[PDB]
């Protein structure tokens, strides 16, 4: 107990010393021989209309051609982004939905929200209509997000300090991940699909394993809860957007934050983040009706996609990197490039 | 410059748009009410007497209005991570119980209800959202007051063991917390457990909110 606390403090000090020792330089002190990108002029090419309420999430398909979007009127919609044509419209059972996902094979979609279950739908039937294939239950608090691993495994997080890995075909949890203290907000699968990352409403994030159940790493430093999270492509980085009006860049090997992303004229909290392919554009929403485009290696810009009349809640890029989609509380989706 | 198949795709998309608009127009007619209260505050008796896991929805109809009432108290989390989801509702129905004036929890249940009401009524998401306040268990309150005055929890009270004086003093002590009197408003009621007046009162408060919103909408 008390001796265990002493050991914990000693290990904490050793971890701090190890983190500080490797700090022979700072990213900004080395990344100061770089030409800034300058202005990024973007414009709306399409304007996807048809929702009649706030929009809470979207997600791109792996072909770079189809979209899925979820709104609080109780609707999932699938869009052709080359013509603004609707391919499917799916009605939900409850209208308190807060997340989406698109299957990497195009066969399935998933959704969830304030009803403590995750619903999985099959798109390609011989009968010519979309119908539910699974409903997963077992969580005790609300549901924040869910990302397919393949056609038969899905990982979910809930505002209970726990996450889970589910085997779709059977309907029984295969492993659970516990150790937080507050709600969990968002997680991003790795490109290689062998780990994941989880941020909780206590200004704490973690790097989590998949088949063991045991967390590999922890990270702190923000002042308040974390609103969004994602994963820089190379496999060992990720950027946090928090509700204390800040972004920061965490790396796994250095075991400490390197660079911060803030501006005094901003007093709001970020509702969603995302990266660009090469790593030279970090896109982030805000509650001040904008959708900024920061430069990752410099912390020296914000190119604004000022087209909305309300808070930007969701934004994302493609796999070929030729577009960007954004959705906000004004019920419109916009495509930029 | 469309081929034979793109025109069929476009026809399909227009069908989908037609159905979406029909559904939205049908769904733009209903009223949404958020229901709140403290532990054992008696929201259960309000849900029951009117003949009507996660969130629990109930719904009903009254005089050509379709009400959806959402109870979210079945969750134990941090309150601040939801209310954005509810900033559109018409009104908030807040229930407290009168008989619990001198039941110490430390300090009393009424102090807990005062803290809760003060927290909710001045939240930043609810500036135009009105509150309908229910005070329950008036009979047992009067029976208790006959021997134990409000001085136990309201030492500054000036009246004696009189039902009207104590009840009015408590009512004003709660209706004082409205710090946005120029945009928000507070309604107050006494649970008529044997009467139907409760639903009519909800109807009246909702209609007032509707009329005020329509006047504000068109500049007039």
């Amino acid at each position, epitope marked *: 107990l008390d001796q265990l606390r002493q050991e914990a403090e000693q290990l904490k000090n050793q971890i701090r010393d190890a983190r500080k020792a490797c700090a022979d330089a700072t990213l900004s002190q080395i990344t100061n021989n770089i030409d800034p990108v300058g202005r990024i002029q973007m414009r709306t090419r399409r304007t996807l209309r048809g929702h009649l309420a706030k929009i809470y999430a979207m997600h791109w398909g792996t072909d770079s*051609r*189809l979209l899925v979007s979820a709104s609080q009127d109780g609707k999932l919609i699938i869009w*052709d982004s080359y013509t603004t*044509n609707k*391919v499917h419209a799916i009605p939900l059972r409850s209208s308190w939905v807060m997340t989406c996902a698109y299957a990497p094979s195009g066969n399935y979609v998933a959704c969830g929200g304030l009803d403590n279950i995750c619903s999985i739908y099959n798109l390609k039937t*011989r*009968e*010519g*209509n979309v119908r539910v294939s699974r409903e997963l239950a077992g969580h005790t608090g609300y549901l924040s997000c869910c990302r397919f691993l393949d056609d038969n495994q899905i990982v979910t997080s809930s505002g209970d300090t726990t996450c889970a890995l589910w085997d779709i075909e059977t309907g029984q949890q295969t492993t659970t991940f516990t150790g937080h203290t507050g709600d969990v907000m968002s997680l991003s699968l790795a490109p290689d699909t062998r780990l994941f990352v989880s941020g909780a409403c206590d200004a704490s994030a973690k790097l989590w394993d998949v088949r063991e159940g045991m967390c590999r790493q922890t990270f702190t430093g923000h002042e308040s809860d974390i609103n969004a999270i994602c994963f820089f492509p190379n496999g060992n980085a990720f950027a946090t957007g928090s509700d204390d009006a800040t972004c920061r860049l965490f790396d796994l090997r250095a075991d400490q934050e390197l660079m911060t992303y803030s501006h005094d004229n901003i007093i709001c909290g970020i509702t969603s983040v995302s990266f660009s392919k090469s790593g030279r554009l970090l896109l982030a929403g805000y509650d001040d009706f904008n959708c900024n485009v920061w430069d990752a290696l410099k912390a020296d810009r914000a190119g604004v996609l000022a087209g909305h009349d309300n808070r930007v809640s969701c934004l994302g890029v493609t796999d070929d990197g030729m577009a960007v989609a954004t959705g906000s509380w004004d019920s419109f989706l916009k495509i930029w490039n | *410059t469309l*081929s*034979a*198949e*793109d*025109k*069929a*795709a476009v*026809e*399909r998309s227009k*069908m989908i748009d037609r159905n979406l608009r029909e559904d939205g127009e049908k769904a733009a007619r209903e009223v949404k009410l958020l229901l709140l209260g403290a532990g054992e505050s008696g929201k259960s008796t309000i849900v029951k007497q009117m003949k009507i896991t996660g969130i629990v929805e109930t719904h009903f109809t009254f005089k050509d209005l379709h009400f959806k009432m959402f109870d979210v108290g079945a969750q134990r989390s941090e309150r601040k991570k939801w209310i954005h989801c509810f900033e559109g509702v018409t009104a908030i129905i807040f229930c407290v119980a009168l008989s619990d004036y001198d039941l110490v929890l430390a300090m009393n249940r009424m102090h807990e209800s005062m803290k809760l009401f003060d927290s909710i009524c001045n939240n930043k998401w609810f500036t135009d959202t009105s509150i309908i306040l229910f005070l329950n268990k008036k009979d047992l309150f009067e029976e208790k007051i006959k021997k134990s005055p409000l001085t136990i929890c309201y030492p500054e009270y000036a009246g004696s063991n009189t039902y009207e004086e104590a009840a009015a003093y408590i009512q004003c002590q709660f209706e004082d917390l409205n710090k946005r009197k120029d945009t928000k408003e507070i309604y107050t009621h006494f649970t008529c457990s044997t009467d139907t007046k409760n639903v009519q009162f909800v109807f009246d408060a909702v209609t007032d909110v509707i009329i005020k919103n329509n006047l504000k909408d068109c500049g007039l």
Partner: single-chain antibody
Amino acid sequence: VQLVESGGGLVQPGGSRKLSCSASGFAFSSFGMHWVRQAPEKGLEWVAYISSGSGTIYYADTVKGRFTISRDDPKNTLFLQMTSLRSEDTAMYYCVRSIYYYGSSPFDFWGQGTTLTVSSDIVMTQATSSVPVTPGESVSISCRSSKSLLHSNGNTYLYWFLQRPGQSPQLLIYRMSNLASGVPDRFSGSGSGTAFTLTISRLEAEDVGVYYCMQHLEYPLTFGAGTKLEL
């Protein structure tokens, strides 16, 4: 999935006749419908087309004006009405299904068909009407056209169908390269505008019949002459 047609028989010169088709096992009110026909010993011929929502209709120039096409969704039925029939209109008639959205597969399920007896567009041809083959032989078939099919949006509206002796046709290759569901992977097809080739590897039994090629670039729809593998 199931489509069943009825209403055939004999009709003397003049008069009229109505054919009906009942569908079961799918969402009838999301599909468009075609009526197709075949002469006793010749190739296929398209007859008419009705769309989903009844907002579009097409006929064949050959006999336009005498044929009416209608549908009824609440009861899931399709009707064709014909009048003043001639001797030229002795043939068998099929009903066909098709659904268009980005990535779908039209013409996949074919009905069974009924027999009826009476007392400036694109051309396409098969090189040969017969070919001798043996098991284990790599077979290929050809088709020729009079104009490019490759539309400037990237597609190529060539289709390949197969009819075995005593059965209905069965979609093999849609849009010139894509395999329908349920087809063994030993089939394939390709080609360059106006000259196309299908190819069957490792010929087995039940691969003997008649092979057809069709185009879907612009109404009217034109079939081929029909090729036969003899074995």
